[model samples]
Target: DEVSLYTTREPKLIQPLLDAFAKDSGIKVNTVFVKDGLLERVRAEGDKSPADVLMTVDIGNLIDLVNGGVTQKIQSQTLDSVVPANLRGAEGSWYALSLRDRVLYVEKDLKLDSFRYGDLADPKWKGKVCIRSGQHPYNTALVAAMIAHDGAEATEKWLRGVKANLARKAAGGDRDVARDILGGICDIGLANAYYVGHMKNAEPGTDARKWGDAIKVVRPTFAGGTHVNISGAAVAAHAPNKANAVKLLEYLVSEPAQTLYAQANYEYPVRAGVKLDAVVASFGPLKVDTLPVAEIAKYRKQASELVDKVGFDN
Candidate 1:
């Protein structure tokens, strides 16, 4: 008898989460799908919208939800256990259900043996490196990660190195950096593994494949590994169905739900032993930094300034 579930992107993943959630609990689930930039619309509606849970991709966007003050504190030991401390919010504002990361893509012929976020700043690779615009959140977040790891003075120095290496005018999205590389724009670019994963699955001759096949992905540096972020969920502060929302949120981190997330979204699961989607795993593994990124989220204002000074042109 119950209805009205909510989410974003690709019905393929959510439908299963809803189905299992239905099987585990009796509430029937319905969903509302929106194109890009829907979060601002939800904020625009304020308390009037029916959204009980906010499911989304990226830390910066999730931080936006918190800044909008729309999310309630999520108090769940299960969530605490599932996501490592470095992967979650301090007040339980949200938890990363799974991970995606920006990795380095280098021409196969390039001399490279290690992956570090800071490696892009090296001089030998100069004039041959390509990174997407600093305007994009993914790149912005990576810059944010750099600011967290390196102080502003050092971070700015690295940016100068990156700027000297720019192959073309700073332009395009992550995948576009891949295209620019193929056009001989630059040899190395930063991208999410999902882009490559999805490209591998694209129908033959499709433009998606063309976009994906443009570069080779490799890690930059930091034995702590590459930077990883998540697509995750949080409860709304003014929820009409607290128990139902928690149940749904809990379901998202469950084994089956985590599987759906990996298989459909090309993400690596947070739950132990859950398999990486074949596509997600082929990009190979790099040690992800153990530091919780929430700290970087707090420093975004300064981070933004430093990124601008570092020269990731808008």
Candidate 2:
């Protein structure tokens, strides 16, 4: 079997998993890295599109592809059994393969083992926090979850409080939060949990290693559960090899592939009982919020609106 994949995930991060699938299933994967405009390119290709699978790093982008009408729902027992109902689309248009928690990065030796997303807004932490632009999809999804848990009025107020606490303007990538923490610019900030693994696991004497060493990961919760996001994909509407695409997706959630996803990429496996990397496990176990991911996505518009209303990036 041969299947071509169109994805936003970097080649290096997923190529091994693709290779293993080829070796195990005798399926040759022709992976294409879609740098941008994934939906537009797929629409442009139309019925002649060779893409069998559409992969993405964020749920927002996955929803974009679905809204663009380029993907088709799938029926697979393997997928249904492995993927949580909340993580996969209601109609099976897409399936999430792995999860990454939105966690807090606090200065090492801070003695802060746990915190709440709401606590980031506490005035005691004012001028002691850092973050990327709230408009970014990562932050927006979190904001959306806040809305899901606390309603718009309270979420908006919380957003303003967070902005007030910023040690510097919310700018830069997730890794920069660690860098700033090391520079003593802030005591804590928000970042993805996997970046902690990437930085800590980098070669010695590198900046990433130093940054990772400077902060301890804290899984922040809302209403007693932590927030998490996914890396997922769906079959293309015009997939020339739909079965193979589905097969590849099923293979991704298998124990071997889940192990590779966890150990190699430093992401949490969506499949239950998959062992985590030592560095990630040390962050303490996560208690994920039970609210459906699709439900959280419903508030994305309100989240974006609040970002602008607060002038969070200004």
Candidate 3:
């Protein structure tokens, strides 16, 4: 059996999973790694697209898939048993395989760098937080999560606050934002925890130590608490191999695949039974938002609007 998949994962994390599935199910897993605009690319192809499965990053992308009406709803009550209600989508059009905590990253020297999520609103950090376009799915989902927890007016207020603290045009990789914190371009940033770990562990030597040594990660406990999202998969609405596609996606959230998620890329497996990786746990236990992911999916547009209205890209 052959399954064509699209992914945003780099080769470092891609090849092993591809091999694992091939060996386990005798399924030939073909893949495309889309760096940007995968949703638009997939939508452009529509039903005629050869993509049988989508394995992209972020819930925003997943929500986009649902909005595009390209994914077929899959009923897997048994599989859904272990996955948390807050992590997967309302319609089961997609499932989250892992979670990442967004943080307030800062340089230790700035003094004002040690701050809270609310501090982005503080006048001290004006022109300080480096971020991506609020229109980006990650930022959008974060806003949606805020809405899920705080309601529209309050969430919009939070948006305006964070927007007032921009360091540069919200642009580039999240890590770049963190890097700016160290470079003195910004004192605070909103970035994934894994970027800090990636720099600390993966960087070559002294430079790694220098960057890791200077920055601190602060988790904001807002009403929704720690905002989390997933790198997940879904079957195409008209999948070329429906059963195999389901099998593949199911496998991704299964024990072995979950293990791969933990070890291969340090992601918290979508599977509840899997333990959080040591590196992830070392960051200290933080409360994750309990809002159902569909709640986040529901506010995508409103969130984007709030982000835009607040000038998140400024």
Candidate 4:
């Protein structure tokens, strides 16, 4: 039997992982890449949706699927035992398979080691900051975590401080932050930890390799924790192959899949004790915030509001 997946994640990133499952289990996996509007497309299809699994990146997007009434909860001891409680949905509506910490990309010449997310606002880094759109799910999730730890008023004040330090408009992809730093446009900025691995692991002489060579990573911490978002999955509310979908979900957290998540994709495995990819491990230990991802998600609305409220993207 074949299991169908509707995923926002690129097929290249997931194909080999699925293929490995097929090799071991004799089940074919079919995937449809949805570039945008995942919830709407599935909801529009209603109960007839061909999706057995809805896979996507970021806790915010996963939460949207649950909130949109498109996912069904699963009761799997395998899932509960392998994935951390904080990284999964309370009702088992969704579960993160990997974690990506929001980290800093610093100029190679910069003298720095440890950093706090709060430090981004310090005057010392004025005119030396770079970042993506504040409304981006990645940044918004970090902002939401800040709000969870520091309260709204303080977070707003910090936001304003960081705004004053921008070297350019708060825009561009996370990798662009690394590229900009290489171009000497800024000294440091926030980016996902995985991009560091990708850049560093890029083939020699590629732009990605040059960008990787130009900067080093700093894992930032704060009261709420090392702010991270995730790429996760949910069972379709009306899946035709629920059993296979559930099996795949379980397989994802198994050692082989988690290893692939760490090495092949350069993402942190959700399961404890999985060794990290060497380049990613060089960034140091990832002590995830004990705060539940759902807790951080609660303030996503306010986080987006704060971004606009501060004219962050303007």
Query: Which parts of model 2 are misplaced by more than 4 Å?
Result: none
lDDT value for model 4 = 0.90
Each model's lDDT: 0.73, 0.90, 0.75, 0.90
Name the regions of candidate 4 deviating beyond 4 angstroms: none
Q: What stretches of model 1 exceed 4 Å from their correct place?
A: 1-5, 8-13, 34-49, 109-111, 210-214
Q: List the residue pairs that clash in candidate 2.
A: none
Q: Which of the two, 2 or 3, has more TM-score?
A: 2
TM-score of each: 0.88, 0.96, 0.82, 0.95
Model 3 spans with C-alpha error above 4 angstroms: 34-50, 107-116, 123-135, 165-173, 184-187, 204-209, 262-265, 275-277, 312-314
Clashes of each: 9, 0, 0, 0
lDDT of 4 by residue, 1-314 (tens): 88999999888888888999998899999989999999999999999898999999888889999999999999999999988898999777999999989998999879998899999999989999999999888889999988888899989998999999999998879999999999999999998988899999999989999999999998888944587788899999989999999998999899888888667679888998888889988988888888788867799999999989999887
lDDT per residue as tens, model 3, 82-195: 578877766667888778778777776555423445556767668777887788777788788777777889888777877777777878877787667778888777878876
- Put down candidate 2 lDDT per residue, 112-191, tens digits, no spaces: 87898999989999999999999988999999999998999989888999999999998999999999999999999999
TM-score of 1: 0.88
lDDT by residue (1-314, candidate 1, tens digit) is 34444455666767767887887788877676755655676777677667777777777778877888878897888888887888878778888887787787666566666667677777877777766666667766777777777777877887788877777657767677667767776788778877777776787798777756665668555537678778877887666777778877877788878887777867678787787766566667656777677755766667677767666673
Error of 3 at 189 (Å): 2.3
